[PDB]
């Protein structure tokens, strides 16, 4: 199937304390493999997946230099955007960066993205053609014009289409024993009577990888879904519940769709 290499950066200003906190996490599909956190004496990029621990010191030195450069840039940017919007330094503000590339089933480049946000709202967005930037606020257009002059879209497009793909393949090779392994969910249906008239049927899906899944209730009313949640060991969990009249429990089936299942699964209590 498809694969992706995604990074998420967060910088939060500390009004009177000098340097902002800067945290960067990297993902391959739904598996985290690296981390950079500037809340340290001598901050470095470290491995967060076991298949990354044979990586050499030249790799970690450069990622550390890139992470430190990025954090310095973000600190200046927090100072400039506070000026753009006429904000006081009494408050703490946030600057986030998400970018990634994804492959298709054929192993070749399918899509890349890159987006910036200030205090949780779209600040600067790389357009789907990877050729131009878009700003929503009037102040953000100041940054857009800086980046249009500097041909920033051309630098970012080169990273996404060539560099990100070449290193995503390298990670898939280094960790394929566990990254290319599909884990189908363990599914069962439970029953808890609310009253004499109605009972609850809850459809469980546990211990599956990747996170993408679909749970549907169907009758031969409204469904309550929960957000897919991490188990803590790299797999995910989810369930879907529906309230049904007592005595008609056998009429309702649960449908489960997941990439690890040879075919979709149907369940009855």
């Amino acid at each position: 199937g498809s694969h992706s290499l995604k990074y998420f950066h967060t910088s939060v200003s500390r009004p009177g304390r000098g340097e902002p906190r800067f945290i960067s996490v990297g993902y391959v599909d739904d598996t985290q493999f690296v981390r950079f956190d500037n809340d340290a004496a001598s901050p470095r990029m470290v491995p967060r997946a076991p298949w990354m621990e044979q990586e050499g010191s030249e790799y970690w030195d450069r990622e550390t230099r890139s992470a430190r450069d990025t954090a310095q840039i973000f600190r200046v940017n927090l100072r400039t955007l506070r000026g753009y919007y006429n904000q006081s330094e009494a408050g703490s503000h946030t600057l986030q960066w998400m970018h990634g590339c994804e492959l298709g089933p054929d192993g070749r480049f399918l899509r890349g993205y890159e987006q910036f946000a200030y205090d949780g709202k779209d600040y600067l967005t790389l357009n789907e053609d990877l050729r131009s930037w878009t700003a929503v606020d009037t102040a953000a257009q100041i940054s857009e014009q800086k980046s249009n002059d500097a041909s920033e879209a051309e630098h970012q497009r080169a990273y996404l289409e060539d560099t990100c793909v070449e290193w995503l393949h390298k990670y898939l090779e280094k960790g394929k024993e566990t990254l290319l392994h599909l884990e189908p969910p363990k599914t069962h249906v439970t029953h808890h009577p609310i009253s004499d008239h109605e009972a609850t049927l809850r459809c469980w899906a546990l211990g599956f990888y990747p996170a993408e899944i679909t749970l549907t209730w169907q009758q031969d009313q409204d469904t309550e879904l929960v957000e897919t949640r991490p188990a803590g060991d790299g797999t995910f969990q989810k369930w879907a519940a529906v309230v049904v009249p007592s005595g008609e429990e056998q009429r309702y089936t649960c449908h489960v769709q997941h990439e690890g299942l040879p075919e979709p699964v149907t369940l009855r209590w």
Binding site: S66, T70, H99, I142, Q156
Partner: peptide, 9 residues
């Protein structure tokens, strides 16, 4: 790998 730098705003 990480991009080398981020744009100055």
């Amino acid at each position: 790998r990480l991009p080398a730098k981020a744009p100055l705003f």
